[PDB]
């Protein structure tokens, strides 16, 4: 793990500050409850945007791996990025193909559809070549 055991335990404790019913997910109602206890007043639409920033499976709620995306974007490492790029780019040509992205998703037990993979490549593919090179990969991970 890149994160230490103490870190994962800590961030799980933070997650349960929002997941007050302990069902493993953070809802817009739970997010709103914490935000108003800290003196804010988000709208229901603004709660939806906050979840949509990190909702990776599109089910409208934040699970713990999604929550770590908020934790990483909260406060921020370029050797881990090179190393991770190589996991994606398995034939070593410096480009992540749709097939290589599907392979990462399969090895991680992530369910996949062509629509979602094609969208992921499209959004990262700044130069329009149909694949994701290293600099396109950096912009995606660090933003």
């Amino acid at each position: 793990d890149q994160l230490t055991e103490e870190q994962i335990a800590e961030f799980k404790e933070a997650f349960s500050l929002f997941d007050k019913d302990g069902d493993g997910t953070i809802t817009t109602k739970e997010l709103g409850t914490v935000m108003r206890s800290l003196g804010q007043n988000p709208t229901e639409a603004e709660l939806q945007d906050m979840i949509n920033e990190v909702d990776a499976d599109g089910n409208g709620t934040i699970d713990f791996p999604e929550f770590l995306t908020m934790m990483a974007r909260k406060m921020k490492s370029e050797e881990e990025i090179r190393e991770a790029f190589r996991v994606f780019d398995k034939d070593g040509n410096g480009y992540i193909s749709a097939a290589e992205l599907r392979h990462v998703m399969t090895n991680l037990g992530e369910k996949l559809t062509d629509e979602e993979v094609d969208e992921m490549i499209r959004e990262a593919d700044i130069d329009g070549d149909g694949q994701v090179n290293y600099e396109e990969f950096v912009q995606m991970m660090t933003a």
Binding site: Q2, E116, E123
Partner: peptide, 26 residues
């Protein structure tokens, strides 16, 4: 899926690639 959803999904895969212990039920 949308452009916000795409970026969220890339970053989730990054977390999972770097932290194998987070894959699966446990």
């Amino acid at each position: 899926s949308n452009a916000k959803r795409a970026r969220a999904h890339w970053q989730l895969l990054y977390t999972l690639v770097n932290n194998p212990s987070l894959v699966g039920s446990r």
